[PDB]
Amino acid sequence: MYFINILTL
Amino acid sequence: IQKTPQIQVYSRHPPENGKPNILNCYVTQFHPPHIEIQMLKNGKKIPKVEMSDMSFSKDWSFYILAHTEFTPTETDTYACRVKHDSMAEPKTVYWDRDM
Amino acid sequence: GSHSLRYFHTAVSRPGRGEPQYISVGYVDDVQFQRCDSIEEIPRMEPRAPWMEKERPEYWKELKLKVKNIAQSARANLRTLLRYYNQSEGGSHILQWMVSCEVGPDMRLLGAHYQAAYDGSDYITLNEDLSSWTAVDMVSQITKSRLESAGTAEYFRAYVEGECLELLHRFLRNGKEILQRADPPKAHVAHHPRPKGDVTLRCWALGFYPADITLTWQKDEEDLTQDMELVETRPSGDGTFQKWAAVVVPSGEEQRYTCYVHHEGLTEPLALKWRS
Questions:
Q1: Domain count, chain C
Q2: Last-in-domain residue among C164, C181, C198
Q3: If both were cysteines, with which of B56, C127, C238, C246 could C202 make a disulfide (CB 3.0 to 4.6 Å apart)?
Q4: In this structure, what DSSP letter does residue A3 have?
Q5: Which residues of B touch C (CB under 8 A)?
Q6: Subunits with at least 3 CB pairs below 8 A relative to chain C?
Q7: Closest by CA position to B45, among listed B62, B26, B68
Q8: Closest by CA position to A2, among listed C164, C179, C227
Q9: 10 Å Cβ neighbour count for C90?
Q10: Closest Cβ opposite residue A5 in set C73, C114, C163
Q11: From the list A1, A7, A9, which residue is nearest C66 (CB)?
């Protein structure tokens, strides 16, 4: 359960 | 990116006339995820159809399983019909006991 | 042997009414353990495996926070991506990402994965060295640049060694009876006469777990893999799978053909021919 901020966070 | 769904209609256990079983409609390899599935008996929509959650594979395409309870017979025809934005018309696949 | 904890996440930008705009499922090997949603910003969580009943409430409490958070980021990225590819405002776009970690048969960390796709196509992938990203165009090159400056990889690495490892080991220890098993396939060759006098031989493999199996037909010692009809492995619905491989053979020449089934549940591959 993780999500990295693809764009501009 | 509309990827046409592949459809397979089969039974959980080998078919025996007069013995209850679960009829599955496994739909895979489609995209986008929005899909409509119905299972039929003699051309009427089966009301209690259970569906697993939708997930996706390494190539990002989706897959889902629909199922219901049924009892094989010679007179009864069971089919699975799906509609996805990638198809002009809905596709109906028939249950064939040997596949 | 060799296990893996995997999550598949999907964010949709124009769901519809009563359809989630965020949805993720988790699996330990070939077994699904939970489902998480967000319909209109209201998180929902549902167990899908036995060993989840032994999960203390501190688990579902933190997850709900994670779902709300991830659902919030996802909708933001969708909008940002839409602006970056200059796509028109009223379209239906999907963003998908997979997060996983696996351990070897000796339970050590083997590796971990992180990959995203936008609209059904790769977008960015985290490298095996867990520090560099591979982008696929100028937009994702913009992204790669940002995650590289920010230092983002180290944070996934922290997660992997933290929560991922912890959940895998725990799910495996508490889900033991389910995940550390290997049920062998029930196989048999069926015989169907075609109308031109010839016959279809279908080699069935039923009720096996894991899903990984190999059915191959052979004429004498000739591998007929290019010429045989094969269905992709499918779920029986009770946690086990099935698959069949068919070849068409002229009547009379049936004994010439053999089916081989390879499964980790079997002691040695089975070699079936049509009986009768």
A1: 2
A2: C181
A3: C246
A4: -
A5: 1, 3, 6, 8, 10, 12-14, 22, 24, 26, 28, 31-34, 52-56, 58, 60-61, 65, 67, 98-99
A6: A, B
A7: B68
A8: C164
A9: 7
A10: C73
A11: A1
Pairwise CA distance, residues B91 & B85, whole Å: 12
Residue B98, SS3?
Answer: coil
**Long-range contacts of C146-153, Cβ-Cβ distance < 8 Å, separation of 24 or more:** C146/A7, C147/A4, C152/A4, C152/A5, C153/C126
Q: For residue B35, what are the β-bridge partners? A: B84
The CATH number of residue B50's host domain is: 2.60.40.10
Declared resolution, Å: 2.1
Counted domains in chain B: 1
B34, B60, B98 member nearest C192 (Cβ): B98
Angstroms from C17 CA to nearest CA on chain B? 13
- CATH code for position C212: 2.60.40.10
CB contact under 8 A, C121 and B6: no
Chain A touching partners, 3 or more CB pairs below 8 A? C
Q: Show the domain range for B97.
A: 1-99
Distance CA C72, CA C235 (A): 33
Task: Name the structure determination technique.
Answer: X-ray
Q: With contact defined as beta carbons under 8 Å apart, do A4 and C152 qualify?
A: yes
Question: Which of C96, C122, C242 is closest, CB to CB, to B56?
Answer: C96
DSSP B23: E
Pick from C157, C187, C178: which is nearest to C33 by CA? C178
Residue C159 belongs to domain spanning = 1-181
